[PDB]
Amino acid sequence: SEESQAFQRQLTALIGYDVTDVSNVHDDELEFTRRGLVTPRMAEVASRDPKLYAMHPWVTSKPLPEYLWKKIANNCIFIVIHRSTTSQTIKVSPDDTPGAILQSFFTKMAKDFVLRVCGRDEYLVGETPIKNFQWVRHCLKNGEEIHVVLDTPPDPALDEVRKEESLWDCDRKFRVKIRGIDIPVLLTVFVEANIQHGQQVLCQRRTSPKPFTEEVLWNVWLEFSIKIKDLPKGALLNLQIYCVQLLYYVNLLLIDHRFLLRRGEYVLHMWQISGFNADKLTSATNPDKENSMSISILLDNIALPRAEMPNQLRKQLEAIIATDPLNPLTAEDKELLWHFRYESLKHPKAYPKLFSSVKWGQQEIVAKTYQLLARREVWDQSALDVGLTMQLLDCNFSDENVRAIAVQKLESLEDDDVLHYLLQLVQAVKFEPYHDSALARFLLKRGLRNKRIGHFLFWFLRSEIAQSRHYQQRFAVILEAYLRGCGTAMLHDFTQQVQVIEMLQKVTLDIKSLSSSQVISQLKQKLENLQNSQLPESFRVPYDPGLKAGALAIEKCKVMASKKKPLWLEFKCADPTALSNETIGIIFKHGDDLRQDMLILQILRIMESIWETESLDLCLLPYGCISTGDKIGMIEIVKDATTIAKIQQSTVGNTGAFKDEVLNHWLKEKSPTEEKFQAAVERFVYSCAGYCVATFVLGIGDRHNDNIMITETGNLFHIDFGHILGNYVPFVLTPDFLFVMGTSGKKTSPHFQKFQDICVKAYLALRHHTNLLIILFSMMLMTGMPQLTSKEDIEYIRDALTVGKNEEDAKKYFLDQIEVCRDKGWTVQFNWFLHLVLG
């Protein structure tokens, strides 16, 4: 076709990568994965209720928390239904199905149609009680009204999808022939060949070192110790170059996507080393065929197809099944898990440890391991454990089958929870030995089934494609698959968004180079230009798919006085049904890898829902933060907020003679009444408690004053998590914070004691999820925070969470942390100043 070759040029512009391209490949895997993905894409498209998918109701099925019940005066929810200019407040009960509120509106008045949210693109369709809509729970949580605009449902037509048009037999020890290396531009140098499987080295060999020149030959055959028949699927040939110090590396999947052993000549362009992480595992070769080191090799020139237990041993097994994810396994622990594998199968918590005790380098062991996977009755039975599920998905498990069972346990996640783990699940795609996987397809299905998950899946993939050459290819094939089944409706919004963001980026990069108030000239000037025959009517806010941004409030926009020059943008809600005029404040920025920030903000959301299991509310503000390309993205602006440093700075800048009372005054200054003031003190006790715990666990507690904000309503929140991570006292409980809790240097108080009891109850609450937090944190550092791995960096969280210790021993560990915070005063703060704001 041709109207199918225009559609191709378009997708490539949204992907930010040219998929169909074949200049940096050495096989049909990616092309093969595209073909393989046509069926999962089509099956989900052909199975999604057209209407329900057009309206994407945002429903949860979790019990309404205690705090939102104590927020319902009398089983009576006040929904304000607005038509044209009319308004009608109605009385609804926590089980009033949305559609059933029509027989409560057409019966409750007189003298087909769906409810939408005012200003938002957030419908209230489907067979669900109102107490199960995030929008509703968000109205009740922050003591707000419930505005609805009765209007015509969207038409599923706009969601139109464009019409789619033997190895176990040779005891031959494995061998690889090194032809040689050749860097186009420059010591001693040797090749290192490893046969790996799930971060587990099966065999190693090297080559006699030779002088480091523009071309280095060898013509050697490296005979490994692994029989051809013993090579597990997912096994990688990892080639490295030392001088001893590492310089280059590349990977080749010994068994391919067709289950055939690799044969023939290979010229691979090797990735460099800068100056552990997920990039080091890629099957992708360097696209930069010029600068980059190369390697020539050759492959051979074969397809792949109950008793009792003592008591001391039982207690030895249990001691191991209990140990946290990061606690290592002795060869003794492993032989133990393996010998009692059948007793280890009855315990789902044993799976990551038992499957890590398997010598994958042996055909017969894997054979029994699969016979073990056949007796999954217990695993399949057990309730879904995300902490356990994520574990079988990390860098430690390269076997297709083990991983698949974990993905199989994910199928039962409702849309609400997919959104909580989407970002990490997408980052987990980097651990997949193959381009096509149960996980890659799962994200595709979940992405196509619901518009919200799909909108977020897009940016997550888009972000990775634009700043990772190690994984862009695999991701590009996944995004393309998604874009060919999301519909023309969404295919259109992603176009508006890409257009809008790309114009703004250009403005950031240029205003960045031209550096005063003279700069304000261009900023205002360029912003008005783009506001014409460019910037389309309105785009969806990327970090909040519900919001639409209209015209650019030029007057409010500016450049910030930071090291780099991020823009401070403001837009009118492009939707008239809006209950206000409050603009949409977005911070635009180039110069930082915003992915680190996304990961942290996402862990913050996981913590809130962990605290929702225990009917708690630590009042955090995990504001929206979307990376949109190479070292660039946007950041939501919290309305009515200032830096804690700015509240101090009022009375001195060049000094910082930190007055232990300015904060409490500021709150009263901003509080309309004195009564609301107490609620702003209330919200402070909680938000300050939340970030104290969370920040401490994540080990980002040592914050530099500037990087802490407060709402004119009591909510406290840290910001700029990208800082403390991009360069590398417990948390932050300064005398001015404590002065809002009625205390000084050394004393107690009613409000303070409460603070200290919200913390311990939140700290221990997180410990009931040790394994989960450890996996996320460990999985976070590996895939998004290079130069923050080493191993010793991963093990920080083991101590923060106080592993081993009973609840009672931990409570007195956190309380002491709260103490190391008082015996410090402003030493810390004043010290940041002597530095950040100086040297």
| Residue 372 assigned as binding residue | no
| Contacts of the segment 60-66: beta carbons below 8 A, 24+ positions apart | 60/132, 60/133, 60/134, 60/137, 60/414, 60/416, 61/132, 61/414, 61/416, 62/416, 62/612, 64/94, 64/131, 64/132, 64/137, 65/612, 65/615, 65/617, 66/615
Query: Near ligand 0TB by CB under 6 A, which window of 238-246, 265-273, 519-527, 592-600?
Result: 592-600
Least distance (Å) between residue 638 CB and ligand 0TB: 4
- Site residues (CB under 6 A) for ligand 0TB, limited to 637-666: 637-638, 641, 643
Cα gap 292→181, rounded to integer Å: 11
To the question of whether residue 743 is assigned a binding role by annotation, the answer is no
Q: How far is the CB of 718 from ligand 0TB (least distance, A)?
A: 9
Cα 798 from chain centroid (whole Å): 21
Spatial separation of the C-alpha atoms in residues 147 and 82, rounded to whole Å: 7
Asked if residue 621 belongs to a known ligand binding site, the reply is yes
**Is 718 marked as a binding-site residue?**
yes
Distance CA 148, CA 146 (A): 7
**One-letter amino acid for residue 147 of the chain:** H
- Residue in this structure with the two tokens 């109102």, named with its chain if needed: 130
Smallest separation (angstroms) from ligand 0TB to the CB of 594: 6
Choice between 148 and 645, CB closer to ligand 0TB: 645
Among 187, 384, 509, 560, binds ligand 0TB (CB under 6 A): 560
> Is there a binding annotation on residue 587?
yes
Contact flag: residue 589 with ligand 0TB (CB under 6 A): yes
Min. distance of Cβ 785 from ligand 0TB in angstroms? Answer: 14
Stretch that binds ligand 0TB, among 186-194, 528-536, 591-599, 735-743 (CB under 6 A): 591-599
Give 262's DSSP letter.
P
Nearest residue (CB) to ligand 0TB, 67 versus 728 = 728
Provide, rounded to whole angstroms, the least separation between the CB of residue 493 and ligand 0TB. 24
- Give yes or no for residue 570 binding ligand 0TB (CB under 6 A): no
Please give the size of the binding site for ligand 0TB, defined by CB under 6 A. 18
Q: How far is the CB of 648 from ligand 0TB (least distance, A)?
A: 14
Cβ-based neighbour number of residue 20 at 10 Å: 14
Other Cβ atoms closer than 10 A to 477:
24
- 722 part of the interface to ligand 0TB, by CB under 6 A: yes
Give the contacts of 334 (CB within 8 A, at least 6 positions apart): 356, 357
| Residue pair 458/479 in contact by the 8 Å Cβ criterion | yes
Stretch binding ligand 0TB (CB under 6 A), from 77-85, 277-285, 305-313, 717-725:
717-725
Q: Is 597 in the site for ligand 0TB (CB under 6 A)?
A: yes
* Spatial contact of 249 and 240, defined as CB atoms under 8 Å apart: yes
CB of 605 to ligand 0TB, least distance (A): 15
Shortest Å, Cβ 647 to ligand 0TB: 12
State whether residue 294 is helix, strand or coil.
strand
Distance CA 109, CA 664 (A): 49
Contact 214, 413 (CB under 8 A): no
Q: Which of residues 328-347 bind ligand 0TB (CB under 6 A)?
A: none
- Selected from 566, 701, 730, 784, the binder of ligand 0TB by CB under 6 A is 566
Nearer CB in complex with ligand 0TB: 98/566:
566
Residue number, 80 or 519, with CB nearest to ligand 0TB: 519
Tokens of 473: 């290819």
10 Å CB burial of residue 371 (0-12, 13-18, 19+) is exposed
Name the residue nearer to ligand 0TB (CB basis): 401 or 643: 643
CB-based contacts of 149, cutoff 8 Å, min separation 6: 82, 83, 115, 116, 117, 118, 577
| CB distance 604 to 618 below 8 Å | no
Structure-token match 């996402």, residue found? 602
- Under rule CB under 6 A, residue 704 binds ligand 0TB: no
Asked if 640 contacts 713 with a C-beta cutoff of 8 angstroms, the reply is yes
Region from 20-28, 470-478, 650-658, 716-724 binding ligand 0TB, contact rule CB under 6 A:
716-724
Q: Pick from 343, 493, 720, 736: which binds ligand 0TB (CB under 6 A)?
A: 720
Return the residue of 523, 587, 694, 800 that touches ligand 0TB, per CB under 6 A.
Answer: 587
The residue within the footprint of ligand 0TB, chosen from 121, 570, 636, 736 (CB under 6 A), is: 636
The residue among 232, 242, 250 whose CA lies nearest residue 212 is 242
**Residue 53 counted as an annotated binding residue:** no
Cβ nearer to ligand 0TB, comparing 44 with 720: 720
635 binds ligand 0TB (CB under 6 A): yes
Beta bridge partner(s), residue 552: 571
User: Which helix (H) or strand (E) element contains residue 558?
Assistant: strand 558-559
Of the candidate spans 25-33, 191-199, 584-592, 821-829, the one that interacts with ligand 0TB by CB under 6 A turns out to be: 584-592
The answer to the question of residue 837 lying near ligand 0TB (CB under 6 A) is: no
Please tell me whether 717 is known to bind a ligand. Answer: yes
27 is in an annotated binding site: no
**Does the annotation list 422 as a binding residue?**
no
Using the structure block, give the residue that is written with the tokens 């417990």: 730
User: Whole-number minimum distance, CB 643 to ligand 0TB, in Å?
Assistant: 5
681 touches ligand 0TB (CB under 6 A)? no
| 725 marked among binding-site residues | yes
* C-beta closer to ligand 0TB: residue 487 or 629: 629
Shortest Å distance, C-beta 515 to ligand 0TB: 16
371 Cβ neighbours under 8 A, 6+ residues apart: none
Q: Segment near ligand 0TB (CB under 6 A), from 44-52, 489-497, 636-644, 647-655?
A: 636-644
Ligand-binding annotation for 589, yes or no, is yes
| 585 appears as a binding residue in the annotation | yes
CB of 621 to ligand 0TB, least distance (A): 8
Question: Which residue in 478, 481, 549, 719 binds ligand 0TB (CB under 6 A)?
Answer: 719
Answer yes or no: are the C-beta atoms of 497 and 171 closer than 8 Å: no
CA 94/CA 132 separation, integer angstroms? 9
Q: Torsions phi, psi of 817, nearest 5?
A: -60, -45
Whole-number minimum distance, CB 475 to ligand 0TB, in Å? 22
Beta strands (DSSP E) in 106-256 are: 114-117, 147-151, 173-182, 188-197, 200-206, 210-211, 216-227, 236-242, 246-253
Least distance in Å: CB of 763 to ligand 0TB? 25
How far lies 97's CA from each of 57, 100, 133, 646, 784, in Å? Answer: 13, 5, 11, 47, 42
Residue closest to ligand 0TB (Cβ): 638
Annotate 553-563 with b (16+ C-beta within 10 A) or e (fewer). Answer: eeeebbbeeee
If one asks whether residue 714 binds ligand 0TB (CB under 6 A), the answer comes out as no
Question: Is 105 or 543 the residue whose CB approaches ligand 0TB more closely?
Answer: 543
Q: Taking CB under 6 A as the criterion, which residues in 614-633 touch ligand 0TB?
A: 623
Residues in the chain: 839
CB of 406 to ligand 0TB, least distance (A): 32
Nearest CB to ligand 0TB, comparing residues 55 and 598: 598
Looking at this protein, which amino acid is placed at residue 325? P
Q: Please identify, using beta-carbon distances, which residue of 568 and 796 lies nearer to ligand 0TB.
A: 568
Q: Which residues of the chain form contacts with ligand 0TB (CB under 6 A)?
A: 560, 566, 587, 589, 592, 594, 597, 623, 635-638, 641, 643, 709, 719-720, 722
Question: Which parts are annotated binding residues?
Answer: 585-594, 620-628, 717-725
Binding residue ranges for ATP: 585-594, 620-628, 717-725
